[PDB]
Subunit: 33 residues, 2 copies
Amino acid sequence: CGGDNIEQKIDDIDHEIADLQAKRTRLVQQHPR
Amino acid sequence: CGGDNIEQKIDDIDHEIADLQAKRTRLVQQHPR
């Protein structure tokens, strides 16, 4: 009773998991040292 | 300037970047195939 209904919910997260990781890097570029 | 004022802001994100990644994996465990 769950083909990919879950795979869809995660795909959403995957978009959020990356958004954050991108915010950390950019901030690092501001202070690499 | 700032020293680590940025490093602190990111550390916060790092906690959020992981929170999401954890939600995706756990969900995967629910549907590995």
